[PDB]
From a paper:
MHC Is are heterotrimers consisting of a transmembrane heavy chain (HC), β2-microglobulin (β2m), and a peptide antigen, typically of 8–11 amino acids in length. Major histocompatibility complex class I (MHC I)3 molecules present a diverse array of antigenic peptides, the so-called immunopeptidome, to circulating cytotoxic T lymphocytes. Here, endoplasmic reticulum aminopeptidase 1 (ERAP1) and ERAP2 trim peptides to the optimal length for stable MHC I binding in the final editing step of the antigen processing pathway. The construct consists of SL8 peptide linked with β2m and Kb HC in which the C terminus of SL8 is tethered to the Kb-binding groove through a disulfide bond between Y84C of Kb and a second cysteine within the peptide-β2m linker.
Numbering used by the authors: 1 to 13, 24 to 122, 143 to 418
């Protein structure tokens, strides 16, 4: 259950480039249906235009994940489409974002204990286009379980995991009413934050909040979260002592002084140490059978030719959950660094993740190199080599 936010009341009166990965959900095989993914990360503002193209022309029906953001405040989204790869068909993903002068096109290259209840809140103004879009997203251990989107005719809190369907009508009635009330606070804050930052009146701006609690195995609060951001940059945040605030620039000092007089830090300490802890307990019970799952990575090495007498050994890790993983290449019992390339861990689209690490080795010396895969679901790290 999310907290009821207090208005920032700041007073009276920078863009990030997306990063793109284009890859198939499964290893591509000509003639075998698959899924083409376009994974876009690290961008801000959140408005983004994504097209998937086959042989230059726009693919008609592409699906999009709902947009989320990470702890660095940047946004990410997964676009995917169904496709059957061939040897000559060319696929690409084109992303149009304000941070770039020109749309970016990235082509598909076949070689490409503690628990937590946290709420990710977004309020984006779109002056002229309508009212600000407001969203509340709840996570039980990185797993989304509830969602509120004001961009509907009759916006309501919705279960996002089947185990949340047990909550009676009274739970969803009050959660939605809190969201609509919370939406109003961010509507007012968006308006006044304009003059506090000396910004023109016609642009789009965002407020982001991360609110929640991390609870150890003993049921005690490990860490409480209450962090605000305006336009993708730190604004104010409750400190680890849960008693004082860290304001990130001059505008946030009015909010900090106002919240000290109002005793807001103590209101949140009561929410985090209490209400947040007890609700996470109720949520964990309903989702016990599904939330604690771990999927071990399955690994394999592929072999790719290079100029002159070099080859590329690419070590794949597929179908693993959670996302955290480590891939290393070794020669003579020592770990390699210099000639080794990575990709950021990326979703497959089915709940599991993928990653690979490659290394350039001399031709004929492939059996001198061993890849190592470290994952929490593996009883012992995987070791494997290129096998023709």
């Amino acid at each position: 259950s999310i907290i009821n936010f207090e208005k920032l009341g700041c007073g009276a009166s920078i863009q990030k480039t997306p990063q793109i990965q284009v890859y198939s959900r499964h290893p591509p095989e000509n003639g075998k249906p698959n899924i083409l993914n376009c994974y876009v990360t690290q961008f801000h503002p959140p408005h983004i235009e994504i097209q998937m193209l086959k042989n230059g022309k726009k693919i008609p029906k592409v699906e999009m994940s709902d947009m989320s953001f990470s702890k660095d405040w940047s946004f990410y989204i997964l676009a995917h489409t169904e496709f059957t790869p061939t040897e000559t068909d060319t696929y690409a993903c084109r992303v149009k974002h304000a941070s770039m002068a020109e749309p970016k096109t990235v082509y598909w290259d076949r070689d490409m204990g503690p628990h937590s209840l946290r709420y990710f809140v977004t309020a984006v103004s779109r002056p002229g286009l309508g009212e600000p879009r407001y969203m509340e997203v709840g996570y039980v251990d990185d797993t989304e379980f509830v969602r509120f989107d004001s961009d509907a005719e009759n916006p309501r809190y919705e279960p996002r995991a089947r185990w949340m369907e047990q909550e009676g009508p009274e739970y969803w009635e009050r959660a939605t009413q809190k969201a609509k009330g919370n939406e109003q606070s961010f509507r007012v804050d968006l308006r006044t934050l304009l003059g506090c930052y000396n910004q023109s009146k016609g642009g789009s701006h965002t407020i982001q909040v991360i609110s929640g609690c991390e609870v150890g195995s003993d049921g005690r609060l490990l860490r409480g979260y209450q962090q605000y951001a305006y336009d993708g940059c730190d604004y104010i945040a409750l400190n680890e002592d849960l008693k004082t605030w860290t304001a990130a620039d001059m505008a946030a000092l009015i909010t900090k002084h106002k919240w000290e007089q109002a005793g807001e830090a103590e209101r949140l300490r009561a929410y985090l140490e209490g209400t947040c802890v007890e609700w996470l307990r109720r949520y964990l019970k309903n989702g016990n059978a599904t939330l604690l799952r771990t999927d071990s990575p399955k690994a394999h090495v592929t072999h790719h030719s290079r100029p002159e007498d070099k080859v590329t050994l690419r070590c794949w890790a597929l179908g693993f959950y959670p996302a955290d993983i480590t891939l290393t290449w070794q020669l003579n019992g020592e770990e390699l660094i210099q000639d080794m390339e990575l990709v950021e861990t990326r979703p497959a689209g089915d709940g599991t993740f993928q990653k690979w690490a490659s290394v350039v080795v001399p031709l004929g010396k492939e059996q001198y190199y061993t890849c190592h895969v470290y994952h929490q679901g593996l009883p012992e790290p995987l070791t494997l080599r290129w096998e023709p």
